[PDB]
Copies of this chain bind each other. A is one copy, B any other.
């Protein structure tokens, strides 16, 4: 099992409240031994001005679930900071909710690399992303 922190979906969702995450309707929704998922609605909150899911907001979803995932793979007292992200948009989404699944590509001492695949409710791949994170020690004095 990948995780080093103990958590529940309910506790994760509470932590994310009052932030860009809750503001965008994003919900941490499911997890397994080595992946975790978040969903997000396609509606006026998340669409670009022509009735489709805003591609930039898709990336917001990817960075959210990947950073969360990366932190859960570290012991208490450590967490991650997003360094960079890239993504390809593969198809437009007009309705329903999308689901982003984060899976680890490499978990280093200092650097983590995560894959995030975002799929429509029809299970079609609509976005693929790769995220690079830095591992930080929370007890270091300068923060």
Contacts and interface: CB of A to CB of B under 8 A. Distances in A.
Interface of A: 15-21, 23-24, 44-49, 54-57, 59-64, 67, 81-92, 105-106, 108, 110-111, 113, 125, 128, 130, 132, 134
Nearest to A12: B49
Given A60-B59, A134-B111, A86 B83 contact: no
Contacts of A82: 55-56, 89
B88 A105 contact: yes
Contacts of A83: 83, 88-89, 111, 132
B86 A130 contact: yes
Contacts of A54: 19-21, 60, 63-64
13 contacts: A18-B44, A19-B54, A20-B46, A20-B57, A23-B45, A55-B63, A81-B92, A83-B83, A86-B86, A86-B87, A88-B105, A88-B130, A90-B113
Contacts of A64: 48, 54, 56
A19 B54 CA distance: 9
